[PDB]
Design a protein around this ligand. Structure first.
Ligand SMILES: Nc1nc2c(ncn2[C@@H]2O[C@H](COP(=O)(O)OP(=O)(O)O)[C@@H](OP(=O)(O)OP(=O)(O)O)[C@H]2O)c(=O)[nH]1
Ligand SMILES: [Mg+2]
Ligand SMILES: [Mg+2]
Ligand SMILES: [Mg+2]
Ligand SMILES: [Zn+2]
Lengths: 621, 95, 238, 681, 37, 231
């Protein structure tokens, strides 16, 4: 147990900046007490410390001159925060107190994704690092605005998340307008005329003898960027409508919100040049498209300038999300017309199957196994149509968006809502031959509801079976990796390994390129054993594999110039009781080569046991 | 973030040296008052309280500001043992 | 005591050129930050004394989609070279004026080739509208006006010539306005506001003026709550 | 198998008597038998709630008995079935066992009927577990109620059928943590069991025969029954539960009010006229608000606090001992030796603090002086106290003090010396003083909030009403619920609740949907249809048409494909209102929210405070004798366990010094912790 | 309870020293005190 | 004929009792409906000052969690009523008043039963405070204070006597504020705002007064725009 600690409930802190937290001053004045007593002596608040302490042992005796001294202690310093369960490095993150009133700790909502904490009352604990070295450590190597990327992937781990996406997606996204069809005539104002009497929409897809254009692109041609938003201001048009704008000499056909975004990024990076050549001004922003934006802005522009970008993006997502005004009324659960037509068929084929079993042609399990396959294909067919619908008829439906934008919920989730929950397993394991036919919009049967509670149970007796202890794996992995520290810089050995780029799984021995991710995995930030000369470029022996290069060698393997890569591993390291810095590679949380002294084995263990609570418990196929 | 975090990373070969440098530097910087400060009157850190700009008590924050001007020098070896435990006391009052 | 009336707010202004300004106001009573933000902003975006082109006379075009011979900018391109052009006056009388531009050959065209007709003092010195190269020639009679806001062509009537076309009216000489309200403290009062406003203008009017006169348009507007007439309310019906 | 009685509220007190555990004398946890046993069995239909159980470790082990369930003379759980013969359903209802049940083809509760008679081609029925579509002729028994499949805490959630079981489990569970509001409301949309729980729980006070009321005051009621009995019923007043939450009655009857048997005389602590009153009904807009509801976080209209809406009265009990000692008896004296007398005011009462006083942290409930030090004065203090006048009294300040982080105002003290009236003393303990401290606890940033469909979130921001989103009639909203906490959950009942609410709000009504019967999508739009009159069909009779911002929205609305292009700007809205969404105005700017937002009434409960999850903070204090690791006092809160997992956390981080100082300086380093303190001072 | 063998507790960095441009004259404090007569 | 500027419009009232008033303003140019009609709504909802019970003393009660013999209401509920009581300070300089209420035996105690004070008008004298029975007796004192915003029990001592109860004080006398913004035409220009501030209040202040005040506030606020200073 620790002597400068504390705990409380956590309430989100949007206004907060990436490297701070909302803390009860009430809390701080325990925690920082002795540090405070001095400042009280340094100031006229006390004659001596015993009197200064005395000044405080009764709440109401505490003069309010005092608090102006706590803020004064704090200035500069940082607290830590950790959260059960600490399943990796980032369960502890340093921030700067912002003394707030009340009984709870406000907490920036970007470190949310790392800490794995939400606000149905998760609590965090706070510690104070004491020694002028501890704080040194804490600020330079635990501050929540220096640990942007992830030790497991390389990928950024403070990204636009929820509301932040929902916001950003909706103002970059451009719209499609149906009442206009495909029409081909003379442009002049003959085009505008149909829109004047309204037969053509505005961002309807249209192609007159000339090019492919909106209406749209024609009616609204803007001189500069701010002339555009000045229009949407006066509500003459939105950031969703498609339009023509001029910039840096280019004549572009986007939306205003595309620019707004292409600006939001521009400004917060102080570098309009390196700004615009990172934006995908051609698609809506979402979970990945930003996740990338960040990463780029992290090699291209410093870690420090990357911190700003995250709050700027966070600030807009919010603001915009509010006024954007989504929700979820029951009517947004938009059921497709096909669900009948399919359950009609499925219902009638179930006839055929039952007649063919009533007859003698299939055995019991032959009948059983048939019916289920039907539903498998069926449960898919529904899930499919549900989405084509949301793409063709309601491409802005709340659910549909949150889904697509990586703001919330997956295919199978939206299904159970619109489509059909489908096959439920029994408690013994064997699937019920009868599925839940309803959806959540329709409301389940008193007995459809029972059916679906056995696997509803199992889906709890599998995570609670790892709640009591699944720090189990990491225990084991730490017990055998802890000693491994990066000791030597170069531990000087000719030898290596060769990562493959092709898989033999079309089988047997039917070759094929391994999914991008797979490669990125074994290649990112490794150190090159032997000069690779591929695609009119020598990647020189002893290089540090830039991600750009992990993409280049794939291009080169697609190109057909390479099949293996001579990479240096820890698998063949020769550091006496450790691992050299070149035999490791990048840091991964930073896009640099790993600095010496790094607890590499511990990171190893955690990283591998962080996600153990999300490996499907026992074999269910 | 913290001032020139990236640049201060570049000054050292490894992450941790800069942590050792900064802390150790701060130790002396807030041992001998702030009498050792290779950082001029006008480029010193400040607060805003009581309506009055007064220098930042945060030693750790000074050393970082300091090293950022390159005025310091660091290495594995620079001086002997207790042989420094007297030099800085005499040039900057050790009371 | 617990306590009393409010501290007089220090309206801080740091100026930078003739298009941009930062306006800090603090401390404000919790919520007033916004209560000032919005109404001032929209006024800054819909009211300030503007002057815009609304109909452009064209020399050698009957249909506004050609590229005029001997000139490598479009009809559509050149009109947008006009929307970026700042005009100011010195006369109270002017409610609408028309200007003239003439040139062809291997020279270099700017904004000064418009005639200083009447009090119209054309602001931006070096501007770019078009470049000619050969025997292709052009000479225009572009119409200017005085009004406020943003007006689409398809939303206004009465045209200049039969050799002219309706365009979009960029009146409001204020380009972009930002303001973030943020929690500020007064020794014992964390609840208070702090308003920071940021104004961008076409260089016609000083932002500080646009502000001054915006705040005034409000002050001035608030007086129209004066000369009251009474009426019956409504019906019970039940 | 015996434990503290849950009594956070009446419902929790009733769920606890209806508990089943496998633990105790029968094999427990160490052998687990997981996936087996913990799995909900094919025989649980109407015998156990498939959806009530503790979360985490003790899942499927502890369990709650289904509403209609019964334990027969032998001890086997029986659910009732009505026997049907020849498709003619009889009321003759049998309580079959588990085994008896497997002998028949029982049918589900929602078979379309025609009086006695089944009006259905295919009848949907269990055949010893396996569901099969069958013919009437084959049926024999039928399900009594959709209810009979679930516990009571479950049966209180409207639109259960639309609610995924996971998130509805949470609901069943959190109603246990309802804590009586002082404006306890029963919900706006009810299931039926509301009255019947309050009675069977003994939440309220009912009349045991017909008669006339004699007396009514806060204290008691005397009633004269038709037989001639004038019986007095005390109104058990401001009493302390196990969990603090105030149990006590409040009368709902006036003087000489003629009255029937079983009629309500005093409401529960959580009954609003015999109706289970666990939370409060509120105007909720569902939508994102500037991050303030970022991940299950929730925002709160200041206006909820002025209405004393989520206020709650909490009695806290303290004790203090007067023990005999080897260093000589210690006292409960008003004369504590220190430096103050101006800080003894509310005390005076010869030790104790006067019934009525405010207490903040640090203030003294009961003063106490104890002998400590082993006779002699300190080698240093012997030189010290002499200068002042060395009485140096051999007594110490062991006075019972207000634990840090709020107390409240005193309601009752109890001074028990020697236990001579018939109170069993404690060995070597002279006397004991109790104090009781009450506090009204309003809503506050941190307070947590729940709904029966499993929505749980913490009050992350209490905005002023100047900022809240408002309806056209100026009515601003009470609570703002982000919607992202919903697709992933799949608890649609919360929306079927927010809609119906929007109706009953203006319809000036409340409803009773029952568990699998209940309101359907047509009737609700139809109720919204009549509600659109109250709301809008009288907006023009006041002389007001439609706003210039409703124009602005409806455009964007019809594009979303929400409303019909072509229909009238008036009746475009009516459509839009039947969907549940209305048109909100951002309370800040006054501009509208692009697109419609579904407002409406939803019922919400303030989840209860545990002291484990009280706000804690240590700078420094006591230390275990043996191991010498930090320890808890009463005024002092110990440190946080710094478990292996957190240790790795920093190793990983190359936080060298930091780790070590968590491992020495701030725990077991006897020498250095002292060395540290001083340096910091 | 010993210092950890890593991070800022790795024999690699640890011994890093810091001094200032003026106390850099501690080399000339011992520089001019040797040869006599 | 200066073709750039406009003419002054028709402010008009439409008061009912003491707690309702609409306020129309045709014609206002496009936008200005919200532009103007809003801020007021904040100021109005937020910052118009009123009066409200701040401290209760009942004869023999020692604190809120107590019940009086022969009195249905408990002190927590008795108070909850007084929260509603609305009073008028007729003389601007009056800053507080302590209303008195004795009552014995069978009767429903209304806000009228409060002992009269000069220049102080009980606006809802029928508001039910408590119902007492045979043998019941409630003698009380009740503090009232002109104030603004929302000051809650905990945030004031108040301590008249040493058995007083300091009650949560909802000060604003402005109970709700809508503002319609419909369209009106002036022949040619056919897009013009009809601003219509609708302010229900409580009785202590006139919709009109409240409105007059809020406007004055915004103005008194627009004051701090002049007088610069660079940082
Ligand atoms: N990396 C990581 N992920 C975790 C962890 N815990 C939960 N998750 C992921 O978060 C998502 C939803 O988590 P829950 O919090 O359970 O969802 P809920 O809100 O519906 O309850 C899941 O995937 P998802 O729905 O695909 O996520 P998303 O797309 O919503 O971000 C899950 O895999 C963790 O400790 N580490
Ligand atoms: Mg979650
Ligand atoms: Mg949680
Ligand atoms: Mg306490
Ligand atoms: Zn190696």
């Amino acid at each position: 147990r620790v002597d400068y600690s504390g705990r409380s409930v956590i309430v989100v802190g949007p206004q907060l900046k990436l490297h701070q937290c909302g803390l009860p001053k009430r809390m701080a004045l325990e925690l920082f007490k002795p540090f405070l007593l001095k400042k009280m002596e340094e100031k006229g608040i006390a004659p001596n410390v015993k009197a200064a302490r005395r000044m405080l042992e009764r709440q109401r005796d505490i003069k309010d001159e005092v608090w102006d001294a706590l803020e004064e202690v704090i200035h500069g310093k940082v607290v830590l925060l950790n959260r059960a369960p600490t399943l990796h490095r980032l369960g502890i993150q340093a921030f700067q107190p912002v003394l707030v009133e009340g009984q709870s700790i406000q907490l920036h909502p970007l470190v949310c994704e790392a800490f794995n904490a939400d606000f149905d009352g998760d609590q965090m604990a706070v510690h104070v690092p004491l020694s002028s070295f501890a704080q040194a450590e804490a600020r330079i190597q635990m501050l929540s605005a220096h640990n942007l990327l992830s030790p497991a992937s390389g990928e950024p781990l403070a990204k636009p998340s929820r509301d932040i996406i929902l916001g950003l997606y909706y103002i970059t996204q451009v719209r499609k307008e149906k009442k206009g069809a495909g029409l081909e005539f003379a442009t002049p104002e003959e085009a505008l005329a149909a829109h004047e009497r309204g037969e053509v929409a505005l961002n309807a897809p249209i192609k007159v003898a000339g090019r492919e254009t909106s209406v749209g692109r024609l009616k609204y041609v803007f001189a500069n960027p701010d002339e555009a938003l000045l229009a949407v201001a006066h509500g003459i048009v939105d950031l969703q409508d498609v339009v023509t704008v001029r910039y840096m000499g280019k004549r572009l056909e986007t939306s205003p919100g595309r620019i707004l975004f292409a600006r939001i990024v521009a400004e917060a990076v102080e570098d309009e040049k390196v700004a615009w050549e990172l934006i995908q001004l051609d698609v809506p922003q979402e979970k990945n498209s930003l996740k990338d934006l960040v990463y780029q802005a992290f090699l291209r522009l410093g870690m420090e300038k990357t911190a700003r970008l995250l709050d700027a993006l966070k600030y807009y997502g919010f603001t915009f999300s509010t006024t954007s005004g989504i929700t979820i009324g029951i009517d947004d659960a938009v059921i497709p017309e096909e669900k009948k037509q399919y359950l009609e068929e499925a219902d009638r084929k179930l006839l055929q199957i039952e007649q063919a079993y009533e007859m003698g042609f299939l055995t019991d399990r032959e009948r059983y196994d048939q019916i289920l396959q039907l539903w498998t294909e069926t449960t898919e067919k529904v899930t499919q149509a549900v989405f084509k619908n949301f793409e063709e008829n309601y491409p802005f439906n709340p659910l549909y968006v949150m889904a697509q934008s990586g703001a919330r919920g997956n295919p199978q989730q939206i299904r159970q809502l619109c489509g059909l929950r489908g096959l439920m397993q029994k408690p013994s394991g064997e699937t019920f031959e009868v599925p839940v036919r309803s959806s959540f919009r329709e409301g389940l049967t008193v007995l459809e509801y029972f059916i679906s509670s056995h696997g509803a149970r199992k889906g709890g007796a599998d995570t609670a079976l790892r709640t009591a202890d699944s720090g189990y794996l990491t225990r084991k992995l730490v017990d055998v990796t802890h000693e491994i520290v990066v000791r030597e810089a170069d531990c000087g050995t000719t030898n290596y390994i060769s990562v493959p780029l092709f898989q033999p799984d079309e089988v047997t021995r039917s070759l094929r390129l391994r999914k991008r991710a797979d490669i990125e995995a074994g290649l990112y930030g490794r150190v090159l054993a032997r000069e690779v000369e591929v695609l009119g470029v020598r990647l020189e022996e002893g290089r540090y594999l830039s991600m750009d290069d992990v993409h280049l060698l794939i291009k080169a393997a697609e190109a057909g110039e390479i099949q293996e890569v001579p990479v240096r591993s820890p698998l063949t390291c020769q550091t006496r009781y450790g691992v050299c810095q070149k035999c490791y590679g990048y840091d991964l949380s930073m896009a640099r080569p790993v600095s010496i002294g790094e607890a590499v084995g511990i990171v190893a263990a955690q990283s591998i046991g962080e996600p153990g609570t999300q490996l499907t418990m026992r074999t269910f196929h | 973030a913290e001032p020139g975090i990236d640049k201060l990373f570049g000054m050292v070969d490894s992450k941790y040296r800069l942590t050792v440098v900064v802390a150790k530097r701060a130790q002396q910087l807030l041992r001998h008052g702030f009498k050792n400060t290779v950082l001029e009157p006008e480029e010193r850190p400040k607060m805003q309280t009581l309506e009055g700009l007064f220098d930042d008590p945060n030693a750790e924050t000074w050393a970082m500001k300091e090293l950022l001007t390159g005025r310091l020098v660091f290495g594995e070896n620079l001086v002997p043992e207790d042989r420094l435990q007297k030099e800085m006391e005499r040039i900057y009052p050790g009371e | 005591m617990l306590d009393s009336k409010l501290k007089a707010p220090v309206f801080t202004v740091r100026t930078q050129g003739r298009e941009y300004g930062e306006f800090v106001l603090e401390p404000l009573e919790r919520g007033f930050g916004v209560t000032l933000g919005n109404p001032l902003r929209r006024i800054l975006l819909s009211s300030i004394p503007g002057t815009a082109v609304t109909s452009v006379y064209i020399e050698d075009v009957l249909h506004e989609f050609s590229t005029i011979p001997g000139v490598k900018e479009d009809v559509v391109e050149i009109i947008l070279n006009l929307k970026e052009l700042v005009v100011r006056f010195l006369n109270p009388s002017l409610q609408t004026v028309t200007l003239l531009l003439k040139a062809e050959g291997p020279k270099e065209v700017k904004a000064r080739d418009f005639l200083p007709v009447a009090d119209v003092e054309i602001m931006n010195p070096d501007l770019h509208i078009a470049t000619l190269e050969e025997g292709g020639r052009l000479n225009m009679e572009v119409r200017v006006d005085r009004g406020v806001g943003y007006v689409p062509a398809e939303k206004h009537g009465i045209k200049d010539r039969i050799n002219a076309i309706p365009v979009d009216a960029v009146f409001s000489p204020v380009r972009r306005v930002a303001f973030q309200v943020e929690d500020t403290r007064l020794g014992q009062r964390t609840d208070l506001d702090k308003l920071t406003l940021r104004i961008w203008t076409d260089g016609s009017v000083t932002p500080l003026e646009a502000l001054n006169q915006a705040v005034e348009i409000l002050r001035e507007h608030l007086t129209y709550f004066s000369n009251p007439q009474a009426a019956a309310v409504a019906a019970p019906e039940e | 198998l015996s434990q503290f009685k849950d009594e956070t509220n009446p419902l929790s007190s009733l769920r606890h008597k209806r508990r089943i555990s496998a633990l105790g004398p029968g094999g427990l946890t160490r052998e687990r038998a997981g996936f087996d046993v913990r799995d909900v069995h094919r025989t649980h239909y109407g015998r156990i709630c498939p959806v009530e159980t503790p979360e985490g470790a003790n899942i499927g082990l502890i369990t709650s008995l289904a509403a209609y369930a019964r334990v027969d003379e032998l001890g086997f759980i029986r659910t009732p079935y009505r026997r049907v013969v020849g498709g003619v359903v009889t009321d003759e209802v049998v309580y079959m066992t588990a085994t008896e049940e497997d002998r028949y083809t029982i049918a589900q509760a929602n078979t379309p009927l025609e009086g006695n008679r089944i009006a259905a081609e295919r009848v949907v029925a269990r055949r010893k577990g396996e569901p099969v579509i069958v013919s009437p002729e084959e049926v024999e028994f039928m399900d009594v109620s959709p209810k009979q499949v679930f516990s009571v805490n479950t049966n209180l959630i409207p639109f259960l059928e639309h609610d995924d079981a996971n998130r509805a489990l949470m609901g069943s569970n959190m109603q246990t943590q309802a804590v009586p509001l002082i404006r306890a409301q029963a919900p706006v949309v009810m299931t039926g069991l509301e009255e019947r729980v309050v009675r069977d729980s003994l939440a309220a006070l009912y009349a045991e025969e017909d008669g006339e009321v004699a007396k009514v005051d806060g204290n008691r009621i005397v009633v004269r029954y038709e037989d001639g009995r004038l019986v007095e019923y005390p109104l058990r007043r401001f009493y302390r539960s196990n969990q603090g939450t105030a149990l006590d009655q409040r009368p709902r009857v006036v003087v000489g009010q003629r009255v029937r048997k079983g009629d309500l005389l005093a409401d529960g602590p959580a009954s609003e006229n015999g109706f289970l009153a666990l939370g409060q009904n509120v105007l909720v807009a569902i939508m994102p608000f500037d991050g303030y509801n970022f991940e299950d976080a929730i925002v709160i209209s200041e206006e909820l606090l002025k209405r004393d809406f989520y206020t709650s009265i909490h009695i806290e009990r303290y004790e203090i001992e007067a023990r005999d000692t080897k260093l000589g008896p210690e006292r409960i004296t008003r004369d504590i030796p220190h430096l103050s007398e101006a800080a003894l005011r509310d005390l005076d009462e010869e030790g104790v603090v006067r019934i009525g006083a405010e207490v903040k942290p640090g203030d003294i409930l009961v003063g106490r002086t104890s002998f400590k030090g082993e006779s002699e004065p300190t080698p240093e203090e012997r030189l010290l106290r002499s200068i002042f006048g060395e009485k140096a009294r051999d007594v110490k300040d062991t006075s019972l003090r207000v634990p840090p982080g709020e107390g409240g105002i005193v309601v009752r003290t109890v001074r028990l010396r020697r236990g001579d009236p018939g109170v069993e003393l404690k060995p070597g303990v002279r006397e004991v003083v109790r104090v009781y401290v009450a506090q009204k606890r309003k809503l506050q940033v941190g307070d947590k909030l729940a709904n029966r469909h499993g929505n749980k979130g913490v009050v992350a921001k209490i905005l002023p009403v100047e900022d809240m989103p408002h309806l056209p009639d100026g009515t601003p909203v009470d609570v703002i619920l982000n919607p992202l906490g919903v697709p992933s959950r799949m608890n649609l009942g919360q929306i079927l609740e927010t809609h119906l609410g929007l109706a009953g709000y203006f319809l000036g009504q409340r409803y009773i949907s029952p568990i699998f019967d209940g309101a359907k999508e047509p009737e609700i739009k139809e109720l919204l249809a009549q509600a659109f009159e109250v709301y809008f069909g009288k907006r023009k009779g006041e002389g007001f048409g439609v706003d210039k911002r409703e124009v602005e929205v409806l455009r964007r609305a019809e594009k979303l494909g929400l409303v019909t292009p072509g229909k009238t700007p008036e009746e475009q809205l009516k459509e839009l209102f039947l969907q549940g969404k209305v048109v909100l105005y951002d309370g800040r700017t006054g501009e509208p929210i692009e697109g419609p937002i579904v407002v409406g009434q939803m019922f919400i409960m303030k989840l209860y405070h545990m002291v484990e999850d009280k706000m804690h903070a240590r700078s420094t204090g006591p230390y275990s004798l043996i191991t010498q690791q930090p320890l808890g006092g009463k005024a002092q809160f110990g440190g946080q366990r710094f478990g292996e997992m957190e240790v790795w956390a920093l190793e990983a981080y190359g936080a060298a010094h930091t780790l070590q100082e968590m491992l020495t300086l701030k725990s077991d380093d006897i020498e250095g912790r002292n060395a540290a303190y001083e340096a910091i001072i | 309870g010993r210092l950890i063998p890593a991070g800022t507790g790795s024999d690699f960095v640890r011994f890093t020293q810091v001094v200032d441009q003026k106390t850099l004259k501690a080399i000339e404090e011992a520089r001019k005190e040797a040869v006599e007569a």
